[PDB]
Assembly symmetry: C5
Homo-oligomer: 312 residues x 5
C-alpha cells in the first residue's frame, strides 16, 4: 500500500532465492525451456513490528492484501508467470518472509558450434523497478538457492545452479533498476548418437569405397549412386532436428566433406572407364591402385584436422 | 480461516484418497500423461461440533469459504490442477468430509531398456506444508482408493493402482512437509509390433541373403544395396517414435547388428567377384558355400545371446 | 440455495435433453471428438409457486444464482465443459425450466477390426450426485432430443442420435448417483480409399508379376525389388494414420499377405535362375509356367477367405 | 435489466453490421477460418429518452451494466467469441448505438470438385432468441457492412462480402428465433500449382515414354520402374494436402489416369520383349512403332474429355 | 474519472513510445510473431494539478482508478494485449507519466520473392478513438523509442527500429480516428543455405552431366534417372523448411529449370543411342561432344538471366 519510508536516504534491500522443482521441454529450434520452482523474498518493514510477550505470539500471518509486497518480474519470459502465494510471515523486529510457487517459460539462446558434444548455459533474470519515493536493490540468499535431486531433463545432464552475487544497476525510462542472473549449466548426453548415426554412416561410406576393387562400370555406378541416395536420406533425418545457424558447425562440415568425397569417387570411376575404353589399361590400373590407399588416408587426415579445428 | 488449535501438542492427520476416472495421452517422448480423478480429504476440527437433537439435523453443509481447508499440492505437475468443490460435510463430533474433482498433467520418467516388451510404473506425489502453529501429516484411506472399470489407456494394459501407506517427512524452506506416493502399473501391448515391424524385416533380410546362390555381380549388387535402402527406411520409421536415451536398448542393438550383417555381405560379394576375376573359381565356390550356412547360424546365435543378455 | 425438501420419501426427478448443434474434429489416434450442443433441464420446486392473478404474469424469470440448480456433470470429458446460461423460467405450479449452451471434448473408444468399412458408436454420459437431504434421479425427455440437419462430420455419415431411457443407479463414495447414456451412431465414407490406395497397389502387384514371362535375371531382380520398395512406401503412408491395436485388422492382414507374396516371388526367381545355370532348361520352364497361373489364383482365394473371415 | 415494453404487439427490431478487419488461417482439412471484425447493433428503448435542452447534452454514454443489451450469438463457431465493448451512445429519442470488437473461429464446409481452380463461399450466421415478454427480429444495415483494404488471405482472392437481407424466422425449443446470413466469396490463386506440380509430372511422364525408341530390355525396365517410383513420391506429396472427400475430384482422376498409363506401358514393354525372343521381330517393331504415336494422342484426348466433364 | 477540460478548442495530444524487450516466434506460414515490450504515455489534465508547498511533496502516484487514462489499442493483434500497469506519476504541473508492460501476437504480411536473400519490414499500428466530447491525437516521443541489446530472433538480423512521425487521420464508423506506425527492419541470415542447399545440388547435377563421356546406354540411363530421384529427394529436403505460399520465388524458378535440364539430358541420351544403333557413329559423336560444352554454358547463362531478373 505504501513502501516503508527511509530513515534518512538508505536503499531497501530485498533478498531473493529460487529453488528448482521441475525443469523440462528444452526445445533446440525454439530455444526455450519451462521451469517450476519456488520464489523466496525477504525485506525489512518497521511499521509491522510487535512485542512478542504482549501479543502472546512469535510469528504473525498476513494475507497478500493489506501489506506492501515488492513487484519482482522476470525479464526473459514469454508471459507473466502464473503464481500462487504459499505463505507470508512477519518477525517481531519487522523482517518479512515471503514464499510462492510459480511456473514460467524462459527464452535463452544456445550455441551449436559443437552440436553433438556441446555444453550450454541457461540464464534467468530478475528485475525490480524503483518507486518514486524509495530506492530498491536486490541481493542473493545463498541458503535458499538450490534444486531437487529428482530434477531431470530428457537428453541432458544437470551440473550446477548458482547465482552471481553482484547485481547490475542501470537507468531505464528515467528510473533505476537492479538485475540478478541465475545460471543453470547442462551437458548433452551424446551416447545415443554414436550407434544411431555415426557408425552406419561409416559403413555406408565403406560400401561406397569397395568399388575400387572392381572393373565393371555398371556395378560401380550402381554402388556409388545408391550409396549417395542413402546418404541423402540420412542427411535429411539428421538435419530435421538441428536448427539453422549463422555459423559453421561440426556436423555440417562433416556432411559437406562426405558430399565432396562422393563427387570425387564418381570422377575417379568415370576417368577409369574412359581410360580403359581407349585401350590404356595400365594407367587405369595405376589410378585405381593409387585411389585404394589415397581415399581412406585423406579421409582420416581431414577428420583429424577438423577435430583439431573445432575442439582445439 | 485459522487452523484448529492442538489439544496439547499432537499433530494433525489428514486422510487422503484418489479415485481414478480417466487417464489418457501417454507421450513417450515427453514422458508425461494426463489424469482425471477424485480427491478425498478428512480431518478433525472440534470448533465445528454441534448438538444433533438441539439442531435437529444429522449432517451440516458449508461453503469453501469461512472454513479451514488444508493446502494439498501435487509435486510433479506442469501447472496447478483445475479444481472444483463437490461436497463438504461435517459430522456431529467435528469430522470434516471433503470431496473434489480435478485434472492435471503429470511428469514421470520411463525406462526403455526392453522397449517393445517393457513395463512401467507411474508416480503421483501429494505434499502438504506445515503451518507456523500446527504440524500436519498425511495418511491413506484404503476404502477411498480405486479406479473405474472403463479406465483405458491406448496401447497399455492397466494392472493395479495402489499407494504406499508410509509417508515421508522432511524439512524444506525451514518447514516440515509430508509426502505420499501413488503408483500406477501398466504393461505395453506388444501384439501389433510383430506383424508390423519384426516379420517384414526378416523377409527383407532373407531376400538379401538369397544372393549367395548366384554368380552375377550386377544382380548381387542390386539386391544387397536395394535391401539396405529398405532397411534404412524402416529404421527411420521405427526411430521416429522411440526417444533418445543414455543407455543401450534392445531395438538399437538389433538394428546395429543388421547393419553389420549388411556390411559383411557386401564384403563377401566383393571378395567372391575379385577371386573369380583372377581365374580362381574353386576358392570362390568354397567361400560362397561356407557363407550360405555361416550367415543364418551366426544370426540366430547373435539374437539368442542378445535376448538372454537383455531379459535375463 | 437449498434442495427442495420432499413430501415423505419421494426422489427428485430431473428431465434432461441434448440438442446437437456442431460436432467436429474426430481424431482416430486419440479417439476423441468435439461437440457443441444445448442442454435442457427441468424439475419441480414448490417453494417458488406463485398466483398468476396476483402477480399479473404467466412466467417469472430468475438469475442462475438465488435459486437452487442441480449440478450435472459429464463423465467422459477431458476437462469441465464451457457453458453459458441462456434462460430460466418458472411456471406458476413451480416447474422450473432451464437452458444452456456448452462445448466439450469427449473421450470414447473405437473399434478398428474393419477399418476401411467400419461403423462406430459414440457415448456421452450424464451423471448427478445425491445431496445428503434429498435423493435425485435422472429422466429422459424425448421431445427435446435431436440434432440440426446441418450437423456434419468430415469423413463420416451420421445415422441417428438417441438416448437410453433407463438410468443406471449405483453407489460411489458413499452416495447414490444416476447415469444416462446418449449414443451417436456413425459410418465411414470409404469411397475415397478405393482409387487412392487399393487400385494402385494392385497395379504395382501386377507389374511385379509380369516377371514370369521373362528369362533375364537382372531385369527380374530389378522389377521385383523395386516393386517391393514401392510397396514399403505405400505401407508407411498407410501406417501413418491407422493407430496400434491389440488385435488384428483387415488392412494389416492384406499388407502381411502382400509381403509374403513378394518373398515367394523372389524365391521363385532365384530357383529358376539356379536351375537354368545347372543346364536343366526344362524344370525351370515348367516351374515358371506353373507359377504364371498359380500366383493369381492363390491371391484371389486368400482374399476371398480373409474377406469371409473378417466380415462374416 | 428488462426488455422494453411494446406499444401494442410490435416486435423489437435490431439492426446489425459486420466490418471485417482480418481474415487468416483457412485450413483446408479442418474446414475452418479465423476472423477479426467489428460488430454493430442498434435498437429502440423509449425509457431512455431525454430532452437535450434540459439535459444540456446531445448524446448520453452508459456503462455496459445497468442497461438492457440484446443477446446475440454466432451459430457456427467452435467456442463463444472473445469480445470487448467499444462505445455505447443513446440518442435523445431513445435510439441506442452499440459497438464491439471480437475474434472467433468459424466452421464452414468446402467443395473440392475443381480443387486447383475452385471458388468457395464462407457463411457466418447470427441468431437471437426471443424473450418471454417481447419478440425480437434482426435486420441489416448496409452502411456498416464492409471490409478493410488491408484484409489479406494467404492463397486466396477476396471478391465480395455481403449479407442476405431477409432473415429466417423459425421456432426452436418452443421459442421463435431469427437468423442472418453473411457470405464471403473467395477464389483460389492457382498460378504456383503449374510450375511446382503440373509441369514436372509431364516431364517425368515423357521421360517414361522415351523407352519406345530402344530395344534394350534392361534399360526400358529401369526407365519405366524408376519413373513410376518418382511418380509415387510426387503423388504422396500432393495427397498430403488434399483432404479425403466422399466424391471424385479432378486431381485424383488425373493421378489415377497416370497410374493406368504406367501399367499399360509396362505391359507393352513386356509384350515387345516376349515377341522379340520368339524370333518374330516384325510384330514387335510394328507394335512399338504404333505405340509411339498411340500413347500421347490418347493421353491428350483423355485430358480433354476429363476437362470437359469437370468444367462443363 | 473525468476527461481533461478542453481549453477553448483544441485536440488532446498523447506522446507514445514503445521500448522492445523480447521478440520471438516468427512463423512464415501464418505471418505472425509475438512481442514483449513497454508502453509509455504522457498527456495533460488540469484538475490533477496540485500545490507542491501545500503538500510538501514532489510527485504523487495515482492508482488506475480515480484518474482518466486514454484507451489505446493495436489494430493488428489476434486478441487484446495482456497488460499490467507498472507506474503512474504526476508532475507538479498537470502532466502525467504512464508506463506499462505487455505481450501480444501481431499480424503482418510477409514477402518471399527473394526467399533466401530477402528482407522484411514488420509493422505495429497504434490507434486511439475520439469521444463524443473531445478530439484526441497521437504524437511520437523519440527519447522513449528504443530496443534492448539482447533482443534476438532465430535466423534473422535486426537492422533498425523507428516510428513514422506523421499520423494518419481518417473517419471510420462515424468517428474520427488516428493511427501510428512502428517499423522494424530485419534481414535473413543466408550463410547456412550455401553448403546445405546450393553445393550438394550442383554436385548432383554434375554427376548427372558426367554421362556425356560414356557410350554404354544402360550406364547413362542409370546415372540420369537415379540422379533425378536424388533431385526429388533433395527437393523434399528443401521444401521441409519453406512456407507453402502461392508465390513465384527464386527457388521455384531454380527447381523448375533443373527439371527442364534433366528432361533435355534424357532426350539427348536417347537421340545419341538411336543414331548409334543405325550405324551413324559420326553424328552421335558430334552431338555428344557438342553437348559437353553446350550444357554448362546454357545453365550459367540462364542462371545469370534469372539472377538479373529477380534482383534487378
Ligand atoms: C571409429 C570412428 C569413431 C567411433 C567413435 C565415435 C565417437 C568418439 C568420441 C566419443 C567420446 C567423445 C567425448 O567424450 O567427447 C567429450 C569432448 C568434449 O570436449 P569439450 O569439453 O567441449 O572441450 O568431445 C571431444 O573432445 C570430441 C573430440 C572429437 C570427437 C570425434 C568423434 C567422431 C566424429 C565423427 C567422425 C566420423 C563421421 C561419420 C559421419 C558423421 C555424420 C554426423
Ligand atoms: C561447370 C563445372 C562442372 C562441369 C561438369 C563436369 C562433369 C564431370 C567431368 C568429368 C570429366 C572426365 C573426362 C575424362 O575422363 O577424361 C580423361 C582425360 C583424357 O586423357 P587422355 O586420354 O590422355 O586425353 O584424362 C583425365 O582423366 C584428365 C583429368 C580429368 C579429371 C580432373 C578434372 C575434373 C574437373 C571437374 C570439374 C568440376 C567442377
Ligand atoms: C578404414 C577401413 C575401411 C577402408 C575401406 C574398406 C573397403 C572395403 C574392403 C574391400 C575388401 C575387398 C578386398 C579383396 O577383394 O581382397 C581379396 C584378396 C585377394 O588376395 P589374392 O588372391 O592374393 O590377391 O583376398 C581376400 O579375400 C582377402 C580378404 C580381405 C577381406 C577381409 C577384411 C575386410 C576389411 C574390413 C575393414 C573394416 C574396417
Ligand atoms: C489376381 C486376381 C485378382 C485379385 C483381386 C483381389 C481382390 C479380390 C477380393 C474379393 C472379395 O473381396 O470378395 C468378396 C466376396 C465375398 O463376400 P463378402 O462380401 O466378403 O462376404 C461378406 C459377408 N460374409 O467375394 C465374392 O463373392 C467375389 C466373387 C468371387 C468369385 C469370382
Ligand atoms: C504439353 C503442353 C501442356 C500444356 C498445359 C499445361 C500448362 C497449363 C496447365 C494449367 C492450365 C492453366 C490455365 C487454365 C486455367 C484457368 O484459366 O483458370 C481459370 C479457370 C477458372 O475455373 P472456372 O471459372 O470454374 O472454369 O480455370 C479453368 O477453367 C480450368 C479449366 C481446366 C483446363 C486446364 C487444366 C490443365 C491441368 C491438367 C494438365 C495435364 C496434367 C499433367 C499432370 C498433372 C499431375 C497433377
Ligand atoms: C489378374 C490379372 C493380372 C495378372 C498378372 C498379369 C501379368 C502380366 C501379363 C503380361 C502378358 C504378356 C503376354 C506376352 O508377353 O505374350 C504375348 C502373347 C503371346 O503371343 P503368341 O506367341 O502369338 O501367343 O500374345 C499377346 O500379345 C497377348 C496379349 C497380352 C497383353 C494384354 C493382356 C495383358 C494382361 C491384362 C490383364 C490385367 C489387366
Ligand atoms: C501428351 C500430349 C500432350 C498432353 C497435354 C496435357 C494437357 C492437356 C490439357 C487440355 C485441357 O485442359 O483442355 C481444356 C479444354 C476444355 O475446356 P475447358 O475450358 O476446360 O471447359 C469449359 C467448357 N466446358 O480443352 C481444350 O480446349 C483443348 C485444347 C487443346 C487442343 C490442342
Ligand atoms: C557457385 C556458387 C557459390 C556461391 C553461391 C552463393 C553466392 C552468393 C553469396 C552472397 C550473396 C549476397 O551478396 O547477398 C546479398 C545480395 C542482396 O541484394 P539486395 O540488396 O536484396 O538487392 O544478394 C544478392 O543480390 C544475390 C544475387 C544472386 C545470388 C545467386 C547465388 C547462387 C544461386 C544458385 C545458383 C546455382 C543453383 C544450384 C541449385 C540451387 C538450389 C536452390
Ligand atoms: C508431345 C511431346 C512429348 C512426346 C513424347 C516424347 C518422348 C521422347 C522423344 C524422344 C525423341 C527421340 C527420337 C530419335 O531418336 O530420333 C532421332 C531422329 C531420326 O532422324 P532420321 O535418322 O532422319 O530418322 O533424329 C533426330 O535426332 C531428330 C531430333 C528429334 C528429337 C528432338 C526433339 C524432341 C521433341 C520433344 C518435345 C518435348 C516437348
Ligand atoms: Cl514475471
Ligand atoms: Cl496442485
Ligand atoms: Cl461437466
Ligand atoms: Cl458467440
Ligand atoms: Cl490492445
Amino acid at each position: 500500500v505504501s513502501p516503508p519510508p527511509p530513515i534518512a536516504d538508505e536503499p531497501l534491500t530485498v533478498n531473493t532465492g529460487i529453488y528448482l522443482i521441475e525443469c523440462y521441454s528444452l526445445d533446440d529450434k525454439a530455444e526455450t525451456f519451462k521451469v517450476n520452482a519456488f520464489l523466496s523474498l525477504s525485506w525489512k518493514d518497521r511499521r509491522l513490528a510487535f512485542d512478542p510477550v504482549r501479543s502472546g505470539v512469535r510469528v504473525k500471518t498476513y494475507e497478500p492484501e493489506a501489506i506492501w509486497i515488492p513487484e519482482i518480474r522476470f525479464v526473459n519470459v514469454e508471459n507473466a508467470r502464473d503464481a500462487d502465494v504459499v505463505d507470508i510471515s512477519v518477525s517481531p523486529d519487522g523482517t518479512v518472509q515471503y514464499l510462492e510457487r510459480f511456473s514460467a517459460r524462459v527464452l535463452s539462446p544456445l550455441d551449436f558450434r559443437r552440436y553433438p558434444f556441446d555444453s550450454q548455459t541457461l540464464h534467468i533474470y530478475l528485475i525490480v523497478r524503483s518507486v518514486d519515493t524509495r530506492n530498491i536493490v536486490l541481493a542473493v540468499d545463498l541458503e535458499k538457492v538450490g534444486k531437487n535431486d529428482d530434477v531431470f531433463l530428457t537428453g541432458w545432464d544437470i551440473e550446477s545452479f548458482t547465482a552471481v552475487v553482484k547485481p547490475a544497476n542501470f537507468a531505464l525510462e528515467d528510473r533505476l533498476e537492479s538485475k540478478l542472473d541465475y545460471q543453470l549449466r547442462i551437458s548433452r548426453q551424446y551416447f545415443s548418437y554414436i550407434p544411431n548415426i555415426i557408425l552406419p554412416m561409416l559403413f555406408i561410406l565403406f560400401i561406397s569405397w569397395t568399388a575400387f576393387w572392381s572393373t565393371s562400370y555398371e556395378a560401380n555406378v550402381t554402388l556409388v549412386v545408391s550409396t549417395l541416395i542413402a546418404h541423402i536420406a540420412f542427411n535429411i533425418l539428421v538435419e530435421t532436428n538441428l536448427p539453422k545457424t549463422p555459423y559453421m558447425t561440426y556436423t555440417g562440415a562433416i556432411i559437406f566433406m562426405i558430399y565432396l568425397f562422393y563427387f570425387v569417387a564418381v570422377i575417379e570411376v568415370t576417368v577409369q572407364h574412359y581410360l580403359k575404353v581407349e585401350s590404356q589399361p595400365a594407367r587405369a590400373a595405376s589410378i585405381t591402385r593409387a585411389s585404394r590407399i589415397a581415399f581412406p588416408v585423406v579421409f582420416l587426415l581431414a577428420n583429424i584436422i577438423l577435430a583439431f579445428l573445432f575442439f582445439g
